[PDB]
Amino acid sequence: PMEEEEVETFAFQAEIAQLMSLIINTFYSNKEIFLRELISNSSDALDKIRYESLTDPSKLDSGKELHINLIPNKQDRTLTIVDTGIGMTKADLINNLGTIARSGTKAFMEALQAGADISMIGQFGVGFYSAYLVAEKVTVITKHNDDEQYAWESSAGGSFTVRTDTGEPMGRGTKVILHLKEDQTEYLEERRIKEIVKKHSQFIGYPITLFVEK
Ligand SMILES: Nc1ncnc2c1ncn2[C@@H]1O[C@H](COP(=O)(O)OP(N)(=O)O)[C@@H](O)[C@H]1O
Ligand SMILES: [Mg+2]
């Protein structure tokens, strides 16, 4: 029986779209910090579970472990960052991942224009968009306790879509799927992934596991 998925399309806020264009079309040293930004986002999302739970018991009754899995797929040329954090409602995806201005965007674009390290992106409140250093398309599957499962997707170019995501239930949390650019396949290598997690992500307070395809 055929599923129906409602799809809505949204313009990125003016400066976020400009930032994405800058990120996409400019060479940066130190691209590898994208992974640090996504793991940090997962970590924040798991912190929120813990604070809902240390503070609102029904959350306590989940049996899911709080964790981050990294899943490179060399066949599909994707890298997926999965967490069991609080997830995002539909409103959350639309508001938080592209329609609302961030006060740091302009200053961050000026800093990059003046040759700052892309690694500074975490301090300007726009760290998610580092995904576009290495990915030509990003899909975010998400499931929050208060909503249905949603998929957000953008190949940049000024808009993104949010749609209900039916079947493949993922349970609470978020999966960010990076469809890597043809020249960024080094981020599918177990040794590369381990290197960058050790160098940039060693104070995450949750277990992170890397799934290596035999
Ligand atoms: N893995 C994730 N789980 C839940 N929400 C996530 C997420 N990754 C990103 N987000 C949402 O996207 C927002 C933007 O993230 P980012 O560009 O890194 O800025 P920041 N300082 O809030 O971490 C986050 O504040 C959060 O609301
Ligand atoms: Mg962040």
Side-chain angles (χ1 to χ4, degrees), residues 1-3 5 7-52 55-58 60-112 114-167 169-198 200-201 203-214:
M2 169 169 74
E3 295 273 14
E5 280 170 357
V7 179
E8 313 180 55
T9 307
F10 298 87
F12 279 116
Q13 194 267 341
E15 286 84 52
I16 290 320
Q18 291 168 17
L19 171 70
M20 289 181 70
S21 182
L22 191 54
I23 281 166
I24 280 187
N25 296 298
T26 307
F27 177 78
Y28 298 96
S29 290
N30 212 24
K31 287 186 171 73
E32 70 193 42
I33 63 86
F34 79 92
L35 186 56
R36 181 197 66 196
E37 294 302 314
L38 303 185
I39 286 165
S40 273
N41 282 341
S42 284
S43 176
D44 293 347
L46 294 157
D47 284 341
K48 286 170 176 141
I49 270 303
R50 255 198 22 237
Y51 284 97
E52 292 201 29
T55 285
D56 219 304
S58 217
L60 288 169
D61 291 351
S62 177
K64 293 166 75 63
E65 169 181 61
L66 300 194
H67 62 223
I68 303 174
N69 297 334
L70 298 187
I71 312 176
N73 186 296
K74 298 204 172 111
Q75 183 96 13
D76 298 342
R77 195 170 80 235
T78 61
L79 175 62
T80 299
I81 301 80
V82 180
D83 64 65
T84 53
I86 26 88
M88 277 177 285
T89 61
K90 193 185 89 175
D92 288 344
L93 283 170
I94 301 144
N95 295 318
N96 297 313
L97 287 184
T99 67
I100 298 301
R102 304 280 162 153
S103 56
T105 308
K106 290 166 142 298
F108 187 51
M109 282 178 309
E110 287 196 346
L112 289 180
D117 197 85
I118 192 71
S119 170
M120 291 307 293
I121 193 170
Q123 292 167 79
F124 296 73
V126 285
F128 173 79
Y129 300 98
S130 65
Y132 289 93
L133 299 166
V134 299
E136 60 201 355
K137 176 175 65 174
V138 175
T139 304
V140 179
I141 313 297
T142 197
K143 176 56 175 82
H144 182 290
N145 278 359
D146 285 345
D147 211 344
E148 285 187 80
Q149 189 164 310
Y150 284 93
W152 170 119
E153 189 159 85
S154 176
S155 306
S159 46
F160 56 102
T161 59
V162 168
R163 68 156 167 85
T164 60
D165 189 41
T166 63
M170 60 166 282
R172 189 201 62 226
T174 301
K175 306 197 292 201
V176 178
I177 310 164
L178 304 182
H179 309 256
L180 296 181
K181 281 165 203 187
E182 166 177 322
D183 43 295
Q184 304 291 331
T185 64
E186 72 187 84
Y187 299 109
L188 303 173
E189 298 294 320
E190 50 258 53
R191 197 196 296 294
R192 189 55 171 125
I193 301 159
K194 284 156 79 180
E195 179 176 38
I196 70 187
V197 171
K198 185 59 165 53
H200 297 284
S201 286
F203 294 82
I204 145 111
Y206 300 100
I208 172 157
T209 303
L210 170 69
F211 292 10
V212 179
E213 349 166 66
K214 172 195 172 276

